[PDB]
Amino acid sequence: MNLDQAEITALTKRFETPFYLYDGDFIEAHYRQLRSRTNPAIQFYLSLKANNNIHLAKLFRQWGLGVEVASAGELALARHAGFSAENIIFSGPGKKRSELEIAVQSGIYCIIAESVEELFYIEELAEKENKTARVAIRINPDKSFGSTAIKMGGVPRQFGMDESMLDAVMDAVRSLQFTKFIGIHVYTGTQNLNTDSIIESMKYTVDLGRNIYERYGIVCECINLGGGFGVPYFSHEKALDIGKITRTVSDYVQEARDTRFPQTTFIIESGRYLLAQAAVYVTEVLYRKASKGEVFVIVDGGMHHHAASTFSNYPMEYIPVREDSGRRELEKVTIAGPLCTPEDCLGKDVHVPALYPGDLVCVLNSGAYGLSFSPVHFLGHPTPIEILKRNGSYELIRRKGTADDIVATQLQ
Amino acid sequence: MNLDQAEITALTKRFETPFYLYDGDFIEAHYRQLRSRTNPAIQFYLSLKANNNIHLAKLFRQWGLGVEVASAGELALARHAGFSAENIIFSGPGKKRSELEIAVQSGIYCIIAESVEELFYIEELAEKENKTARVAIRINPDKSFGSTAIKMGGVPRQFGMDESMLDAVMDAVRSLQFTKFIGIHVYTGTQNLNTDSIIESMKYTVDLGRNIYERYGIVCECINLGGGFGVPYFSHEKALDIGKITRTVSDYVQEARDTRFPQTTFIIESGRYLLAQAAVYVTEVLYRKASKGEVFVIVDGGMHHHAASTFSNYPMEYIPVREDSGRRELEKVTIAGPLCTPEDCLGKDVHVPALYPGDLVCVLNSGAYGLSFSPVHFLGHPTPIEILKRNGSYELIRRKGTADDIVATQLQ
Numbered sequence: 001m002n003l004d005q006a007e008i009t010a011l012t013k014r015f016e017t018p019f020y021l022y023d024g025d026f027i028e029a030h031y032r033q034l035r036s037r038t039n040p041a042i043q044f045y046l047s048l049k050a051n052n053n054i055h056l057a058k059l060f061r062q063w064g065l066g067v068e069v070a071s072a073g074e075l076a077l078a079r080h081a082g083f084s085a086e087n088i089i090f091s092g093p094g095k096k097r098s099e100l101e102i103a104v105q106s107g108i109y110c111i112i113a114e115s116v117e118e119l120f121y122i123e124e125l126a127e128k129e130n131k132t133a134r135v136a137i138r139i140n141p142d143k144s145f146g147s148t149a150i151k152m153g154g155v156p157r158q159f160g161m162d163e164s165m166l167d168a169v170m171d172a173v174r175s176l177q178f179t180k181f182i183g184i185h186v187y188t189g190t191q192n193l194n195t196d197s198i199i200e201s202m203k204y205t206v207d208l209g210r211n212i213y214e215r216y217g218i219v220c221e222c223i224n225l226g227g228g229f230g231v232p233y234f235s236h237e238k239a240l241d242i243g244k245i246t247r248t249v250s251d252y253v254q255e256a257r258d259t260r261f262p263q264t265t266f267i268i269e270s271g272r273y274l275l276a277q278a279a280v281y282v283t284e285v286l287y288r289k290a291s292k293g294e295v296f297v298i299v300d301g302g303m304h305h306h307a308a309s310t311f312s313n314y315p316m317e318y319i320p321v322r323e324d325s326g327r328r329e330l331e332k333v334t335i336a337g338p339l340c341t342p343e344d345c346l347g348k349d350v351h352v353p354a355l356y357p358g359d360l361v362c363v364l365n366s367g368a369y370g371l372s373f374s375p376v377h378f379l380g381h382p383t384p385i386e387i388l389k390r391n392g393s394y395e396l397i398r399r400k401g402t403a404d405d406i407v408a409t410q411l412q
Numbered sequence: 413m414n415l416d417q418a419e420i421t422a423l424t425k426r427f428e429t430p431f432y433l434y435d436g437d438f439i440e441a442h443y444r445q446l447r448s449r450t451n452p453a454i455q456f457y458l459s460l461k462a463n464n465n466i467h468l469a470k471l472f473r474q475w476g477l478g479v480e481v482a483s484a485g486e487l488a489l490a491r492h493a494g495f496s497a498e499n500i501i502f503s504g505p506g507k508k509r510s511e512l513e514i515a516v517q518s519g520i521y522c523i524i525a526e527s528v529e530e531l532f533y534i535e536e537l538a539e540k541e542n543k544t545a546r547v548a549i550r551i552n553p554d555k556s557f558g559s560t561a562i563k564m565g566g567v568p569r570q571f572g573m574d575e576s577m578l579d580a581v582m583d584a585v586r587s588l589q590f591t592k593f594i595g596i597h598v599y600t601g602t603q604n605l606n607t608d609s610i611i612e613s614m615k616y617t618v619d620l621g622r623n624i625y626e627r628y629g630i631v632c633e634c635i636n637l638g639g640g641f642g643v644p645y646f647s648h649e650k651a652l653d654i655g656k657i658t659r660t661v662s663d664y665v666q667e668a669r670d671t672r673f674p675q676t677t678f679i680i681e682s683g684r685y686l687l688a689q690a691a692v693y694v695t696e697v698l699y700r701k702a703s704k705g706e707v708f709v710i711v712d713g714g715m716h717h718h719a720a721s722t723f724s725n726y727p728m729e730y731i732p733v734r735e736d737s738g739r740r741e742l743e744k745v746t747i748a749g750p751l752c753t754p755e756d757c758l759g760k761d762v763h764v765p766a767l768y769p770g771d772l773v774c775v776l777n778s779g780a781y782g783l784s785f786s787p788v789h790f791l792g793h794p795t796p797i798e799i800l801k802r803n804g805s806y807e808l809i810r811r812k813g814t815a816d817d818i819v820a821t822q823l824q
């Protein structure tokens with residue numbers, strides 16, 4: 001997203017730092033560029049865990065994406081955002097029966113089961129609710145992807161069910177009288193910057209769909225290719241070749257649609273790739289000090305709002321505001337937040353133009369795994385404002401937190 | 413705290429897992445044993461950041477402790493808990509002017525300043541409010557403590573002001589007409605398991621008080637010795653010799669009271685030591701699976717409630733509940749929570765009696781840096797119930813979270 005320093009300075013007169021600022025024009029253009037390159041039989045699904053703000057999620061709903069939820073709470077958020085039931089899928093390795101109950105009662109597109117015991121729970125709830133529950137299976141492939149792993153055969157994971165267990169899973173599936181099997185899901189992990197490994201895993205997932213037809217005579221109605229598209233945060237990281245991924249997977253999916261899967265919905269999921277680059281976290285320098293030969297710059301935001309930046313260094317931009325100093329030589333500094341813990345460090349030993357109280361530190365690539373990934377109540381600071389810029393206007397999409405927010409669960 | 417397995421099983425019939433259970437009888441006995449060993453001129457202060465539950469904090473208030481707050485939000489919590497202004501101190505390296513304003517308006521015992529610029533902000537606010545503001549200074553000693561650091565002279569830190577800057581700080585202090593200097597504070601860091609290093613730092617802090625009298629003619633009314641008393645979490649860790657710390661520091665403080673400091677309040681702060689061992693985090697096994705030669709046990713709680721256990725392994729106790737299996741051989745397993753991320757791991761490669769759905773996993777030493785240290789809204793799961801056992805009765809001290817708690821700041 002392009003950062004306008006005068007725009008950000010102006011916003012800090014209207015909104016108290018620290019805040020997240022989202023470029024909604026970039027969000028839309030970035031999504032549409034991805035969409036335009038991708039076979040129309042593939043539907044994109046937003047992973048809500050990457051950002052729990054319903055006003056951002058509503059944008060993707062309006063553009064036709066589905067949403068992937070991982071809890072009954074995220075299911076509620078998805079409905080606040082206006083996603084229809086036919087565009088909601090439910091993942092996760094530890095769904096409680098009460099969560100399965102709400103999912104069955106909601107009639108969502110599918111619950112992606114991660115164990116045989118889960119399948120039987122779903123069946124029991126479908127019977128009690130007099131519904132046909134739609135289920136997919138999350139498969140942990142018996143193959144490792146990329147050109148760097150040592151051992152063949154895939155990796156031990158708490159997620160889903162080993163591919164080697166498919167016969168037992170399909171035997172269970174086909175015995176469930178109130179449950180309809182609709183397909184499969186493979187997800188190889190987040191922050192994947194290896195273009196070829198992504199292509200390989202998605203092709204492998206289409207091929208698993210073929211294998212299920214060959215072995216069981218079932219044509220998957222939904223094949224969820226996962227994704228995990230990474231975003232570069234550090235200088236040594238390179239962006240994915242999104243052109244190569246979209247072209248190669250689109251062609252592989254088209255060949256499947258032309259043969260065995262003419263009415264199958266293919267899904268690519270994304271959280272980070274859709275949102276990370278669209279936001280900046282803006283924080284004001286409160287104090288500057290020297291300690292034992294080092295310089296420390298203390299800012300008004302930190303780990304309780306943006307934990308991921310705390311634990312290399314995120315990309316950052318600096319806005320000089322203080323009107324009295326012109327003493328802006330490059331220096332090595334540590335940028336620390338306001339928390340009473342040495343872990344609250346946005347940047348250690350970072351080489352910046354000299355930062356003084358009133359200057360702004362802007363943390364880039366902050367749109368995913370930001371506020372909701374952080375220990376928001378640690379040390380009792382107010383949760384931050386979030387602002388959405390779009391179509392030339394600015395909209396408050398999250399109010400500043402209050403102390404009453406902290407004690408709500410305690411008084412009650 | 414002693415864990416009664418039948419008690420915990422009975423509680424899970426009344427309260428939905430996952431939950432925190434606090435032994436309030438242990439909290440009181442553990443505190444009173446510490447108090448009894450300590451010179452009465454030392455007052456203990458609870459560090460609220462270790463646990464933000466006001467019902468626990470109220471216990472310490474009733475026993476006469478002070479409270480150390482690190483934000484205006486924690487100041488509000490301290491007042492909910494009934495701490496009087498004369499028993500509240502305010503620390504932190506990044507206090508906003510709005511936080512300083514509320515602290516001045518509240519007339520608290522002192523604001524512990526961490527920069528000269530902070531001192532001037534406080535003075536300006538005291539003038540505007542027509543109050544005398546009480547301030548202490550946080551000093552970063554020019555000495556390293558223990559018998560393991562290489563370089564002499566102390567360590568670069570974002571906290572407080574280097575001891576070498578004392579003349580400049582005292583020159584600033586003495587120029588503030590609406591602010592009263594009341595003393596000093598040294599805090600060397602959390603989870604300190606080195607008995608002698610604690611004794612050395614506390615003695616050094618008393619000696620700094622003497623140095624301030626010798627150099628400036630000022631008798632500190634408050635000398636805050638900090639603390640950071642650690643608690644052993646892992647098998648290789650040894651408990652502090654609390655007897656040695658309390659006896660040696662009490663004697664050193666008594667010598668100061670008998671000579672130069674007859675009316676000085678000495679403070680020892682504690683969060684972790686007062687609370688860590690008093691709680692268990694109880695979580696139910698939802699699913700069990702094999703993946704690629706390993707066993708995974710998925711529980712209903714995890715990183716979003718108790719991040720510290722996720723990133724060795726905390727001490728854990730296991731309660732067999734499932735009534736059908738007797739297949740309890742020792743096995744190596746990974747215990748994972750319900751979140752859609754491999755980081756949600758309570759125990760990797762841990763050797764336990766075989767765990768089956770319905771069994772309970774109890775994470776010990778969970779009373780400090782627990783719920784409020786965790787990304788409670790990540791993935792949208794309800795925040796957990798907290799229960800206080802005391803005097804033979806059980807009290808709900810935090811209700812289960814709801815989806816409305818997540819969206820409150822977004823709708824509004």
Ligand SMILES: *Cc1c(COP(=O)(O)O)cnc(C)c1O
Pocket residue numbers: 047049050068091187189190191226227228229269270271272273752753
């Ligand atoms: C985490 C998650 C996603 C989103 O991952 P990103 O790397 O943010 O795109 C997609 N699918 C599943 C199953 C997930 O758990």
Ligand SMILES: *Cc1c(COP(=O)(O)O)cnc(C)c1O
Pocket residue numbers: 340341459461462480503599601602603638639640641681682683684685
């Ligand atoms: C963190 C903190 C404490 C509490 O530390 P514990 O190790 O939990 O006892 C005390 N004083 C200050 C200044 C702190 O920042």
